[PDB]
């Protein structure tokens, strides 16, 4: 009864050393090597001494079919680069072969990515940790019976379905620059999962996430979307993130939180057009962490891999409440972080097309929808 919701949190961290060897193909922006860069960087910072590190299991087809269809999972187990010709029609109906190519060990990559998220949720359900971290997860675009946006198996939906075994209401927050369409779609008609996505909107992948998309049926008003423009910075992002999340916590009152920390919302991303720094990005982890709820932190987007390693290393230290110096320690990828070799980055001179009046107007309309909750 003496608890006040403070103190350092117990953090469990999931990582498989084989994740960095999976290769999407020549010229493909998604590079699972960024996860190994992140792991090696936080190891050289000494963060392994403050958290428990687990190697996730390979999620089975049964675990994946808790959401995905049997036909789509069977296709993922069978498709390989040496038999693509025989599956020419199946590759098209499941949206595999372009943005989501076939590569060696594709199904194993999905198992390692998904295994970390479901094992994190199990660890949270058993009340054996405060936070669970899986940077290989967060693949928020995967649909029930098709791939999308470099994502094949939606580890988030499976991890949330695992949390729903013991938690009445689960909150999902998506700070990836892209709309969390796969997660929102899976829980669009239920009030047991509330999805909140902040993203660039307007002539941008995936094309969903309009302000007026608020859910359907029993899930109406349980889907929140904050459409943004190019060039948003730390001050403008933090001006709306904390008050929006605070009101969601007050109205919805979840018992568990899932935070997708897509790094492609950082300044200088290969595919992103935002202007956030690592501190402004990590500020979102600080806000969610204050509420002292079972929190599952996941990865996601991020295609300037040197900044992805920076972002997820610092956000792990933030989860551990460990201050780390800005001078990067030596690591196996020290040359990737030139020419400064610092941990934190600086924003660009790009224009912030999100005026302060625009941010205040979108926030006010979201507050109207949040008033419609019991």
């Amino acid at each position: 009864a003496y608890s006040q919701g403070g103190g350092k949190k117990k953090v469990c961290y999931y990582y498989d050393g084989d994740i960095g060897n999976y290769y999407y193909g020549q010229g493909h922006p998604m590079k699972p090597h960024r996860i190994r860069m992140t792991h090696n960087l936080l190891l050289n910072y000494g963060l392994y001494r403050k958290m428990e590190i687990y190697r996730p299991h390979k999620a089975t087809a049964e675990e994946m079919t808790k959401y995905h269809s049997d036909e789509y999972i069977k296709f993922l187990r069978s498709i390989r680069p040496d038999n693509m010709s025989e599956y020419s029609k199946q590759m098209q109906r499941f949206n595999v072969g372009e943005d989501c190519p076939v590569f060696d060990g594709l199904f194993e990559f999905c198992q390692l990515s998904t295994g970390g998220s479901v094992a994190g949720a199990v660890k949270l359900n058993r009340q054996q940790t405060d936070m669970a971290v899986n940077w290989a997860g967060g693949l928020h675009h995967a649909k029930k019976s098709e791939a999308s946006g470099f994502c094949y198996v939606n580890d988030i939906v499976l991890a949330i379905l695992e949390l729903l075994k013991y938690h009445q209401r689960v909150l999902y927050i998506d700070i990836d620059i892209h709309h969390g369409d796969g997660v929102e779609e899976a829980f669009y008609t239920t009030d047991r999962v509330m999805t909140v996505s902040f993203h660039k909107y307007g002539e941008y992948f995936p094309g969903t996430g309009d302000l007026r998309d608020i859910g359907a049926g029993k899930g109406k008003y349980y889907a929140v979307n904050f459409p943004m423009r190019d060039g948003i910075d730390d001050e403008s992002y933090g001006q709306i993130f904390k008050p929006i999340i605070s009101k969601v916590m007050e109205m919805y009152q979840p018992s568990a939180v899932v935070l997708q920390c897509g790094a492609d919302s950082l300044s200088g991303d290969r595919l992103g057009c935002f202007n956030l720094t690592v501190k402004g990005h990590a500020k979102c982890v600080e806000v969610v962490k204050t509420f002292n709820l079972p929190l599952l932190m996941l990865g996601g987007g991020g295609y300037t891999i040197r900044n992805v390693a920076r972002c997820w290393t610092y956000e792990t230290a933030v989860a551990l409440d460990c201050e780390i110096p800005n001078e990067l320690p030596y690591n196996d990828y020290f040359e990737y972080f030139g020419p400064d070799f610092k941990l934190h980055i600086s924003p660009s001179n790009m224009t912030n097309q999100n005026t302060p009046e625009y941010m205040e107007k979108i926030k006010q309309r979201l507050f109207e929808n949040l008033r419609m909750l019991p």
Binding site: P29, E98, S148, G149, F150, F205, P206, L271
Partner: peptide, 8 residues
């Protein structure tokens, strides 16, 4: 997703 290729 990728502006360099396709529609995603």
């Amino acid at each position: 997703x990728n502006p360099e290729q396709x529609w995603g």
